[PDB]
Amino acid sequence: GTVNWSVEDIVKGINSNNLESQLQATQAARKLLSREKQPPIDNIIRAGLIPKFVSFLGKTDCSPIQFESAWALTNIASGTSEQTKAVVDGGAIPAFISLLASPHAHISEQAVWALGNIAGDGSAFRDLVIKHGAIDPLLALLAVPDLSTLACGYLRNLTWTLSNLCRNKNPAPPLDAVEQILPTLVRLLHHNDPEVLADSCWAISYLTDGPNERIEMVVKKGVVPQLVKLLGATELPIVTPALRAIGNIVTGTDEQTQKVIDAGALAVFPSLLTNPKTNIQKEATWTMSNITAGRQDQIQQVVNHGLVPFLVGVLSKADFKTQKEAAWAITNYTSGGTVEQIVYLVHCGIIEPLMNLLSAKDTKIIQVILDAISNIFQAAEKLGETEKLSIMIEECGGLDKIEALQRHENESVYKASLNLIEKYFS
Ligand SMILES: CC(=O)N[C@H](CCCCN)C(=O)N[C@@H](CN[C@H](C(=O)N[C@H](Cc1ccccc1)C(N)=O)[C@H](C)O)COCc1cccnc1
Ligand SMILES: CC(=O)N[C@H](CCCCN)C(=O)N[C@@H](CN[C@H](C(=O)N[C@H](Cc1ccccc1)C(N)=O)[C@H](C)O)COCc1cccnc1
């Protein structure tokens, strides 16, 4: 019936002076826009149909045409930024917000989905959705005593949309909107459905991706223990944003970082640092590099949790981007650690994999590694053991790699390797 219409026939029907004819053609548009291979969005837009769809959103007397036009606009707003913009320019934002409280659940769900698509386009439209007042009615849809009585797709829909209201930067979302949304996010983070949990963790990762004041308003809600729990989930779609969020938080203050350690996060890291998914192992090592940039008593907890051999592990064999993160973790460790903490690091076998990485062509890692070697030599200086260190480095073939760094030229690299060869190695 309404299958595979041309855009011309859709236009003929929608332009008619007959509500049923308009409904039939709007449904035909919805089906065109719902096909998987190349839905003709630009053709629909060029025909001038967006304003008609938007006016149909307000037809309270005809809920099927509200539903059909809502679904059509949702699929257009899902497209390119230019196409999302056409939807906004047609006036759809307040028309959708008015539909959030519809007695028909399928229409309210459309409005949630479409507003998520619009907010999901970027910072300006996110902020414009907030200004038109979407947050209060969005949160009101979740005001039940037990989230478990809501339909599954329905709850995942609202969670996805809320996380888009948290998502982008330059600027980050308004402080007031964040504070308004956070309590609901905390509740969702405790819901038993893997998609809601994943989406909730993504939202938290967005909110922690900024300056320390932003991280603080999240940590103040008490979510770090729950995030650490999700960090140990079996589902990779949960683990990935939980680790992102956790990694964002330890970019903050030493006190914010200590909350992560206090919650038991370090115990999960033997698994994460050997995880078969490359990006999980990369972000775990990145996370370690920021914990080793903390206080000496925080470095010490890394020691007590047995994590230094795992750092030697990743430095020895990992994807190259992961190894670079491990190199950073080692330079931070040696820059902040005690003499004794540095000696332990050498006892675990850090020198050889460190030296082997001087063969890498990436200039910035070579800098980082040379810095680390310097910090370790300063430890041997206080113990009067520079010579034993030089012998270790020489025998594993490190000296040749440092020698060769001089024919290499970066102003700092060529330099740093000189100093080392003059100061030690006679
Ligand atoms: C971060 C983000 O959301 N990014 C973009 C938004 C585009 C902006 C570009 N300028 C995005 O991927 N959006 C949506 C697009 N929905 C498209 C769509 O057709 N959705 C329809 C709409 C719908 C909704 C409710 C009931 C029935 C139908 C669907 N669920 O069948 C998909 C890909 O077909 C895929 O679904 C994601 C989503 C959005 C809102 C709520 N839940 C899920
Ligand atoms: C040694 C030191 O001073 N570290 C401080 C944090 C100390 C917190 C103590 N608890 C530091 O800046 N550590 C890392 C984190 N870099 C951050 C970073 O990479 N952020 C983004 C995400 C982000 C952005 C803003 C805040 C929080 C998180 C990312 N995932 O790429 C921002 C861009 O600076 C950057 O430096 C390590 C590094 C450099 C290059 C490559 N890998 C790791």
With b for 16 or more beta-carbon neighbours within 10 A and e for fewer, the 204-223 pattern comes to: bbbbbbbeeebbbebbebeb
Tokens of 301: 């907890």
CA–centroid distance, 251 to ligand 2, in Å, is 6
CA geometry: angle 266, 353, 310, nearest 5 deg: 15
Return left, alpha or beta for 133; rule: phi > 0 is left, psi -120 to 50 is alpha, else beta: left
Tokens of 316: 């020895």
Ligand 2 atom closest to residue 257's alpha carbon, by position in its atom list:
10
Assigned CATH topology for domain 1-426: Leucine-rich Repeat Variant (1.25.10)
- Please enumerate, as own/partner, the contacts of 80-89 that have beta carbons within 8 Å and a separation of 24 or more: 81/121, 81/122, 83/41, 83/42, 83/45, 84/117, 84/118, 84/121, 84/125, 85/121, 85/125, 86/45, 86/50, 87/50, 87/114, 87/118, 88/118, 88/125, 88/128, 89/50
Tokens of 311: 């750092």
CA geometry: angle 221, 225, 227, nearest 5 deg: 90
Give dist(CA 9, CA 116) in Å, integer.
Answer: 30
- CB 209 near ligand 2, within 6 Å: yes
CA–centroid distance, 25 to ligand 2, in Å, is 53
Cα diameter, the chain:
96
Atom 25, ligand 1: residue with shortest CA distance? 110
Give dist(CA 387, CA 199) in Å, integer.
Answer: 54
Cα–Cα distances in angstroms (integers) from residue 149 to residues 119, 153, 191, 326, in the given order: 27, 12, 12, 46
Give dist(CA 141, CA 97) in Å, integer.
Answer: 12
Is the distance from CB of 111 to CB of 70 less than 8 angstroms?
yes
Tokens of 406: 């001089």
- CB 102 near ligand 1, within 6 Å: no
Tokens of 9: 């026939």
Give dist(CA 359, CA 17) in Å, integer.
Answer: 76
First to last CA, the chain: 89
CA–centroid distance, 243 to ligand 1, in Å, is 25
Give dist(CA 420, CA 426) in Å, integer.
Answer: 9
Is the distance from CB of 40 to CB of 83 less than 8 angstroms?
no
User: Which helix (DSSP H) or strand (DSSP E) does residue 131 occupy?
Assistant: helix 123-131
Is the distance from CB of 138 to CB of 96 less than 8 angstroms?
no
- CB 68 near ligand 2, within 6 Å: no
Give dist(CA 340, CA 331) in Å, integer.
Answer: 16
Atom 40, ligand 1: residue with shortest CA distance? 113
Give dist(CA 194, CA 147) in Å, integer.
Answer: 14
Give dist(CA 293, CA 288) in Å, integer.
Answer: 9
DSSP assignment string, 252-283: S-HHHHHHHHHTTGGGGHHHHTT-SSHHHHHH
Is the distance from CB of 115 to CB of 93 less than 8 angstroms?
yes
| Experimental technique for the deposited model | X-ray
- 170 by Cβ neighbours in 10 Å (0-12 / 13-18 / 19+) ranks as exposed
